[PDB]
Design a protein around this ligand. Sequence first.
Ligand SMILES: Nc1ncnc2c1ncn2[C@@H]1O[C@H](COP(=O)(O)OP(=O)(O)O)[C@@H](O)[C@H]1O
Length: 208
Amino acid sequence: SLRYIVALTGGIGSGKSTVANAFADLGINVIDADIIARQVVEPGAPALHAIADHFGANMIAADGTLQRRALRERIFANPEEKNWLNALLHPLIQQETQHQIQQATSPYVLWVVPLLVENSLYKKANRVLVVDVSPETQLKRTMQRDDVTREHVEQILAAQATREARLAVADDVIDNNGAPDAIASDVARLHAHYLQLASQFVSQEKPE
Ligand SMILES: Nc1ncnc2c1ncn2[C@@H]1O[C@H](COP(=O)(O)OP(=O)(O)O)[C@@H](O)[C@H]1O
């Protein structure tokens, strides 16, 4: 069956995790792009064999686990490797993402993609939801949460797509720079619409 996909995105410290949990409490399966990226290098995964062939047998421990720290340290001191690794992992992530989408039984799925705008992944979503906050909120909330400096987070903000680039592709926007508890009511409203969209998308004769 064709699953209805709502993609969630937002910059660092905007509320991706918080919003995702709100949808999960309503019974929606969350498919998280960062979890998928870790899944494709889990013990026994096909990517591990290719990684051992390219980087050396010792990239994989005796117990079949990827030596994460060891890979990170190799790729960081060999820039093009990041690109080699991403190319290897890309198709595998696409397949695992679809498999999980296929495996989810909720009325629609929430696909959480930090790099949605950067990687133009909104082209694979039926609906785009952006959790939005002010840049200052991103700074204060990320600093607190990760115990890092303001300047450190300012660099992440300048590396990520901008606030406006995200709003340009959004179908819906949830504001999180206010009270944490206005989240439940806004998510319920969006969920109600998403149930309708998902229930009629397959037969919907004309657009919206
Ligand atoms: N409305 C809010 N007010 C204050 N803190 C919040 C609010 N919403 C979420 N948080 C916190 O802000 C931080 C960043 O939110 P989070 O969802 O983790 O961000 P990200 O978008 O990076 O996933 C977290 O520690 C979270 O608990």
